[PDB]
Every structure is written in C-alpha cells, then in structure tokens.
Amino acid sequence: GSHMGKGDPKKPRGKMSSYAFFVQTCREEHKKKHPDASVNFSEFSKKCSERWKTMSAKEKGKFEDMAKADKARYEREMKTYIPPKGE
C-alpha cells in the first residue's frame, strides 16, 4: 500500500488520462443500462482496463484528445494556486 505523507504543496496535478476517459465512458454506459446496479469506478476499472489494453490506435486516439481537454480544468487551478515553499 502507498503511504501518503502530509506536507505536500497541495498543488493541483490531477487531470485524467485517456484510460480514465475510457473507463468513465464504459461505466456510464452500463450504469445507464442498470441504474440500480452499482458500477463503482474501482470495481469497473478492471473490466474497462482489459478492454482499453485491447483497443487499437483508432479507439485510443479518441480518448487521448479528450484527456488533453481535461488539463483545461487543472491548469486554471494550478496557475492561480500558490502552494507552500516546503515549510
């Protein structure tokens, strides 16, 4: 297990990648088909990952481009958020 230690700058660095954009899709599609069947991100991550790794450059390119657009919501945050100097 990864132990996280406090004292970090709390700097916004969390923008999702292509994989994540794929996993968020495959999930919602199934969640809409079954609104009463919990499709929790973590438990479905393994179902999407096996498909993600088996998709070609055509299918991945779609999720890449979109993942690039996610930086737009992280940039604005980091560009204005002034973190500690490591005190």
From Swiss-Prot:
PTM characteristics: Phosphorylated at serine residues. Phosphorylation in both NLS regions is required for cytoplasmic translocation followed by secretion.
Task: Mark the residues carrying the PTM N6-acetyllysine.
Answer: 6, 10-11, 15, 31-33, 46
- The entry's DNA-binding region feature spans 12-82
How is expression of this protein distributed across tissues?
Ubiquitous. Expressed in platelets.
What's the protein name?
Answer: High mobility group protein B1
Extract the ranges annotated as region (Sufficient for interaction with HAVCR2). Answer: 4-87
Full protein: residues contained: 1 to 84 of 215
Sites binding heparin sit at 4-13
Where can the Isoglutamyl lysine isopeptide (Lys-Gln) (interchain with Q-?) cross-link be found? Answer: 31, 46-47, 71
